Amino acid sequence: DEGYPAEVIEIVGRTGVTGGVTQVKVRILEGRDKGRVIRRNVKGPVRVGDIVILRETEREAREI
Amino acid sequence: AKPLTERFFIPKEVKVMGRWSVEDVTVEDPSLKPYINLDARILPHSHGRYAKKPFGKANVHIVERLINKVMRSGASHYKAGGHFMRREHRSIMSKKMKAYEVVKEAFMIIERRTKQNPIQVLVKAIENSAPRDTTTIAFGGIRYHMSVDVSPLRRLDIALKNIALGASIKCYRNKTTYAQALAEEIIAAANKDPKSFAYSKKEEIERIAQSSR
Amino acid sequence: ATVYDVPGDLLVERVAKALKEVPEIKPPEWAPFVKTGRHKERLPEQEDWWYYRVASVFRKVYIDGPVGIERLRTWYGGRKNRGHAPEHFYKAGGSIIRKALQQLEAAGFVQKVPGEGRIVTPKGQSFLDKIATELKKELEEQIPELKKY
Amino acid sequence: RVIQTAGKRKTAVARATIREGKGRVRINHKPVEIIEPEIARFTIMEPLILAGEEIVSRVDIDVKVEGGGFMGQAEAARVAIARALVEWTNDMNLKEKFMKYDRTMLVGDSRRTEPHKPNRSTKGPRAKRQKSY
Amino acid sequence: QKARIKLASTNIKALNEVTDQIKQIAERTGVRMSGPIPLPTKRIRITTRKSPDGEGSATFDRFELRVHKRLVDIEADERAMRQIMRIRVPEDVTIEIELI
Amino acid sequence: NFRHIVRVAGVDIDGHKQVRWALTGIKGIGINFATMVLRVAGIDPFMKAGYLTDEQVKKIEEILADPVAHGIPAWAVNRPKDYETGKDMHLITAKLVMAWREDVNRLRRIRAYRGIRHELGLPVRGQRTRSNFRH
RNA sequence: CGCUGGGGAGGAGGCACUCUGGGGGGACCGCCGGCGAUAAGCCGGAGGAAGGAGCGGGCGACGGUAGGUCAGUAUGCCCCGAAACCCCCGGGCUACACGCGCGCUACAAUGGGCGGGACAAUGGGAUCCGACCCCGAAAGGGGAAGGGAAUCCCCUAAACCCGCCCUCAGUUCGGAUCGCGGGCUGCAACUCGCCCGCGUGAAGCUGGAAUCCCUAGUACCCGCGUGUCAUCAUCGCGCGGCGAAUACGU
């Protein structure tokens, strides 16, 4: 399976029981749902400008 | 024995170990492109200068990172391939020369058997061994095992660790050597063979994560 | 052209091969029944180890001369397996070094400064430098960067 | 004319001397092309390979280096050689090249050892025995 | 024809004193002196355990005594010795002079 | 032209190994004494066994029967200054076992510390038996 | 020396370089970006030897813990005079069916052996360090220059590199235990010391439940000095060599 790219644009805050997760807002580069901004969680160090590959685009994580 | 034109090797061009180029190498994953350092160098050795700074690892050449992974003892406080690998006096810990040579031989074998650039081979292997996981999150009092995505830098760390561990596995208390094992692992992961520890764990991790979505 | 332009490995090998024509350099009575030091476990495997040891002593007196026996002992010593106890460094034995130097003297390759050590003679110098010239001409076939030296 | 330079790397000190010549380089009386191991040889010769033939085939360099390990010696010699070449040429393209490659060629390395402390002093300052209660 | 002076002290005040004295002597007079030359400082370290008993975590006191060393050569004139030997030599300084 | 398992005094040693290491399978002979005996006999210890001529074997046995007479310094031997004869000698397996036995038994027969320790089965030399040496 | 182009050793003569050690300078969120009450401040970029009390240490407030030390010395009460006081000889604290803590060596090829090639720092040294010569297979023995220590000595460290043998085996892994012999210290080496040679060749094939230490010249790996000391270091206190992985959080 080839996922769908999306570009990080805003760090929200640190989540998780141990501080290993990070809530993020991403923009869909291209695919089916291009141009949409959603909210997603990400494990690991991140920064604005990074790219992530999503298997879904349709889970819309919960606000912290 | 090593011939003399190999024991006393003198480089003339800027080339990894004086032998292999980078301009013909091409990455394709837009997520990992900006973290795979392909700078033209001769000696991949940074002497621990880029550790303090948070994102200082994007300035280290892939080959130096792989050498540093290979510079290990095995598996302490966890089991790999079913068993602890504790060497503790016959380990290459703080010995970068041996890891350098191991990687060099592995690259030679890869070139011999593939007729391509071992750096392109390693790049495709990373691309195919990088996992796109699950953790534990509390939405207030209650905790759930959730599925979260991963970042490129952690992906790279994962892939390199897994390749090195695959080699250390296949070279454990057997007639095979560490260089041959590393070459086997790299070719397997690059052509997507389930014979590879790294591709195996990538598939397993994605499999589990898919469950707890 | 000089001992400093070639490695010590090939040079010691070739010097030992060449010392097999000097009649004053012959292994002694107890050579095949001893180790090279207490730090050693097993005795030497080669049958012509005397000549290699003598050649190395010769090159060392050349390089680091004037020098005596204790410093050469320190060079030829090493680490020891002590069993369940940890490893320590120990120095080698002296009779081998003494006999090697006495033989080189009788052959006229070294002399003793009266009070500090032993040095080479002009003929010893010529010996070594000629052998090194041969070896360097051979090596230049492979390492073309050595021609300028 | 003649020029002298120096280089430091932990506990090791190197002094280099450059003058007119053919392209020979010696480190403690022996050529740099038969230096072992390869990981030290490349270390020493990286600046020469960056400077090139049209600059190195006209000079002769001699380095006396003592103290602190073969890798430290090699790094110190590398530093000294880079400095000597930059000064002898008084060229700035070379300096920009060396800086974009690795700024520790011309600049040094300030790191030294941390002193050891009790509770297993021998091992290190921060390492300790283990407890089991 | 040269006299050699060795100065040793745990305090540098007396050393600066004596050395400026000798410099003024040999400058007001016609006589040459080489120095002063600082030799490496000699330090004595004694490390011991604080506790008088064996209980408690172990802690250590590091005590250090430092000794500074200076050297001079004065050319050994006659007026030189006569005007040098009679100088205020405090008790926190040790001096030794010899011939060469 | 290589015998794959040769039969030397008392023992049927392996020919697939070098001579210096095959002779090691005999009780009373280590690698070093073996190298000595072979250098005296005039045989290359670094060669695959099997071409051990009958006369070579006989000469090895001649040596093992009386090593000092054939050289073999008296300080490289198993039993110097024998308690009953002097006559530095080297034993292989049989009066070796028997000589160990006779030494221990003469120690017991006079009621000595070491003999009593041998009897009871405890450390003999000086060791501290409180924390280790658990059956 | 080869191809007169190169390379070494002295002793004159110098303080250029290194080093030594006294006196001064230099970094202050100072400049620029953003985030913050426009305040106190936070993150980042350059420049720079060094960047965010630069790094690492010493000095540890008022209090309390009936925490430990009368077996370091000092001291109240109680107790022991031919004695629990003062000296000599011999034994013991080293005893071993076992349960524990901290470690050393290993269970092998990310290796074992042989021969060759390299490369430190800290400290210490008068009946002390002992170069250099001669004996000895080794441990060690006989003479002995110099040195009160930037002058002499301890001191050519190991891991590392090269070539050859071994090729996955309780083995050329491992090295406990025991026999015969040779030495040192010391008034004395059995109980109860340390070293050397030849033989001997036990468990151990990566380790459950559980648990420890570590954010950079740090951790892992390697050896050395010094304290104790007539002799004896698998310890304490320190020294350099090679040198990472992860996180900039809760």
Swiss-Prot record, chain A:
Pfam families: Ribosomal_S28e. Keywords: Ribonucleoprotein, Ribosomal protein. The keyword Transmembrane does not apply. InterPro entries: NA-bd_OB-fold (IPR012340), Ribosomal_eS28 (IPR000289), Ribosomal_eS28_CS (IPR028626). GO terms for molecular function: structural constituent of ribosome. One of its GO terms (biological process) is ribosomal small subunit assembly. One of its GO terms (cellular component) is cytosolic small ribosomal subunit. The keyword Iron does not apply. NCBIfam families: PRK04007.1 (NF003080). HAMAP family: Ribosomal_eS28. Part of the 30S ribosomal subunit. Belongs to the eukaryotic ribosomal protein eS28 family. This is Small ribosomal subunit protein eS28.
Swiss-Prot record, chain B:
The keyword Ribonucleoprotein applies. It holds the Pfam family Ribosomal_S7. Transmembrane segments: none annotated. It comes from the Archaea. The keyword Membrane does not apply. Keywords: Ribonucleoprotein, Ribosomal protein, RNA-binding, rRNA-binding. One of its GO terms (molecular function) is structural constituent of ribosome. One of its GO terms (biological process) is translation. GO terms for cellular component: cytosolic small ribosomal subunit; ribosome. Part of the 30S ribosomal subunit. One of the primary rRNA binding proteins, it binds directly to 16S rRNA where it nucleates assembly of the head domain of the 30S subunit. Is located at the subunit interface close to the decoding center. Belongs to the universal ribosomal protein uS7 family. This is Small ribosomal subunit protein uS7. It comes from Thermococcus kodakarensis (strain ATCC BAA-918 / JCM 12380 / KOD1). The gene is rps7.
From Swiss-Prot, chain E:
Part of the 30S ribosomal subunit. Belongs to the universal ribosomal protein uS10 family. Keywords: Ribonucleoprotein, Ribosomal protein. This is Small ribosomal subunit protein uS10. The lineage of its organism: Archaea, Methanobacteriati, Methanobacteriota, Thermococci, Thermococcales. PANTHER family: 30S RIBOSOMAL PROTEIN S10 FAMILY MEMBER (PTHR11700). The gene is rps10. GO terms for biological process: translation. Pfam families: Ribosomal_S10. GO terms for cellular component: cytosolic small ribosomal subunit. The keyword Ribosomal protein applies. It comes from the Archaea.
Curated annotation (Swiss-Prot), chain F:
GO terms for biological process: translation. GO terms for molecular function: rRNA binding; structural constituent of ribosome. Gene3D superfamilies: 1.10.8.50, 30s ribosomal protein s13, domain 2. Keywords: Ribonucleoprotein, Ribosomal protein, RNA-binding, rRNA-binding. Signal peptide: none annotated. The keyword rRNA-binding applies. It comes from the Archaea. GO terms for cellular component: cytosol; small ribosomal subunit. Transmembrane segments: none annotated. Pfam families: Ribosomal_S13. Belongs to the universal ribosomal protein uS13 family. Part of the 30S ribosomal subunit. Forms a loose heterodimer with protein S19. Forms two bridges to the 50S subunit in the 70S ribosome. Located at the top of the head of the 30S subunit, it contacts several helices of the 16S rRNA. In the 70S ribosome it contacts the 23S rRNA (bridge B1a) and protein L5 of the 50S subunit (bridge B1b), connecting the 2 subunits; these bridges are implicated in subunit movement. This is Small ribosomal subunit protein uS13. It comes from Thermococcus kodakarensis (strain ATCC BAA-918 / JCM 12380 / KOD1).
